């Protein structure tokens, strides 16, 4: 969101008093809105690259890498908890069998 900063210095950055319908300010604010929205989306994208904070599609990618597939109507929180539990399954003892049952 450095679009106004790196813009050509002579162009106006502010809607001109002489005309409320200044098309230059309209175009500039439009482009600035898209720049800031893309920056927002890029900042929020970090949550998809972590198992802790991943959501639907990327969480399904993680579960496909771990081997665990989403059930019918299975939300993200319970699904990630199920993946984490599936990785940490004790096996080979009475307590493990009792928990599995």
């Amino acid at each position: 969101a450095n679009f106004l900063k790196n813009l050509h210095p002579l162009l106006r950055r502010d809607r001109n008093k002489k005309d409320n319908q200044d098309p230059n300010f309209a175009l500039i604010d439009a482009l600035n809105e898209e720049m800031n929205q893309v920056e927002k989306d890029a900042i929020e994208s970090k949550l998809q690259s972590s198992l802790k904070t991943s959501t639907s599609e990327y969480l399904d990618k993680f579960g496909d890498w771990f081997g665990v597939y989403r059930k019918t109507d299975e939300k993200d929180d319970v699904y990630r908890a199920r993946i984490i539990k599936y990785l940490l399954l004790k096996r080979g003892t009475n307590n493990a069998i009792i928990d599995a049952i």
């Binding site: 790196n6 050509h8 210095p9 002579l10 162009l11 106006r12 950055r13 502010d14 001109n16 200044d22 098309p23 230059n24 300010f25 175009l27």
Partner: protein
């Protein structure tokens, strides 16, 4: 690839066409072979052409002459005045008008937030072409401080620092800086001082700018046909 196309003229012959283009009548048989014509090559009117439309051509029909033509090496004298106007317009480029409202940024030349886009009155963005384009670009370069523009250290001018004393020396500095800024443009063939004066605070000067001639712009644009870009990355 490009080839010449000839319109059959009244009571023309293939021998005359061959002499006219190839400079020898001997190529008339090649012209027949390439165009696939039957013996009455150039019929009098379309009633005869109805007998065999495929293999005959009438008056006003277009023939193809397979000679490799090229738009460069063409005598500018043939080119129509409108065609020359369009060619120089292409050469000097089309750009979005920003130097509208001359009075405002003439009242505040050294400051920022001085110029802005505008509309052409037809709900589309305004555009300056040819001489108007050159005016816009030269004004913008002169007005831009040097090194302020991103990705372009050398674009601009040092006039914002030349607000010095009232002596001939600063006048000469201003003149030299202005000549440097004008010479920086590739399209400006040369620039030179006309007259200047000092009225205490106020300095006044005027310059003469010779843009590239019609012939050079025509040659440049017709050469560009080989690439098909028809655009300016100077």
């Amino acid at each position: 690839m490009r080839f010449k196309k000839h319109v059959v003229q009244h009571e023309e012959t293939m021998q005359a066409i061959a002499q006219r283009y190839y400079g020898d009548v001997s190529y008339w048989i090649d012209l027949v072979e390439h165009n696939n014509l039957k013996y009455p090559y150039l019929v009098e009117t379309d009633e005869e052409k109805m007998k065999d439309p495929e293999r005959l051509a009438s008056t006003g029909d277009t023939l193809i002459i397979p000679i490799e033509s090229d738009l460069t090496d063409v005598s500018a004298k043939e080119i129509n005045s409108r065609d020359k106007d369009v060619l120089v317009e292409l050469a000097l480029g089309r750009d979005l008008n920003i130097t509208a409202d001359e009075k405002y940024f003439n009242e505040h030349g050294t400051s920022d937030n001085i110029l802005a886009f505008s509309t052409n009155g037809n709900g589309d963005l305004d555009t300056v072409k040819g001489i108007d384009n050159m005016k816009q670009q030269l004004q913008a370069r002169l007005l831009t401080p040097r090194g302020s523009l991103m990705l372009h250290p050398n674009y601009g001018s040092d006039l914002h620092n030349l607000f010095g004393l009232n002596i001939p020396e600063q006048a000469t500095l201003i003149e030299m800086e202005v000549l440097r800024t004008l010479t920086s443009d590739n399209r400006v063939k040369s620039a030179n001082l006309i007259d200047w004066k000092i009225q205490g605070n106020v300095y006044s000067g005027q310059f003469s700018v010779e843009i590239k001639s019609v012939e050079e712009s025509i040659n440049f644009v017709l050469g560009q046909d080989e690439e098909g870009i028809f655009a300016l990355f100077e």
